[PDB]
């Protein structure tokens, strides 16, 4: 989830 957050946000 942190990686997905970095990418999208």
């Amino acid at each position, epitope marked *: 989830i942190r990686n*997905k*957050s970095v990418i999208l946000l």
Partner: antibody
Amino acid sequence: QSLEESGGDLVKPGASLTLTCTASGFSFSAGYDMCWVRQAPGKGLEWIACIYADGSGSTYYANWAKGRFTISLASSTTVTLQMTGLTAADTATYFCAREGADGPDYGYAAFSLWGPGTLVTVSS
Amino acid sequence: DVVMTQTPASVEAAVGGTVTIKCQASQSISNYFSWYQQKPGQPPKLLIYKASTLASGVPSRFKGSGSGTEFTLTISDLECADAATYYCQSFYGSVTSDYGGFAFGGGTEVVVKG
């Protein structure tokens, strides 16, 4: 492309159960997540977990689901959900869903493709 | 975890009319926000993603708007085929920690008055 869930059944409190989501018309590749969402009878949608479709196997979970639920990519066309410690609070239709994308590198964090659902009933 | 407060729980409007659904986020969220239509016995159908972009084949009488902590779905030129339960959904997360995921509103039942 389509999805179909299977494995729902009547199970006793305390039981474990594995659900399967089978993809047709595509196989998993990078650029999106595959996820499970459930819906108790007469209630709303509740997200459970996602897994990267890119082959890494990286997963992330709703806080309530950590420790009782595991999502896996079992093949290039199947996602599974292993559920444990089941109670009546877990009775629900369980949906498999594919995250949509408008570019090739990652998705847009909404679910564009859904299976019809499979029903899990936790009862004695 | 973000909580989406979706109102109203139910709404009725005439054929040809307009229904408006509001979703309020418990904290500021990004525009990775979506809306779904669910008919009984069917899975949800994605209507709008990124707050206001129409999914393929969805007509522009479905209009997603808003930002920050308040998002809105406006359904105009209502048809009997629009009778369904609608849900909002937020994606939320943190660049710093292993926190985030997907939060759904509680749903709005739409009754179309013919």
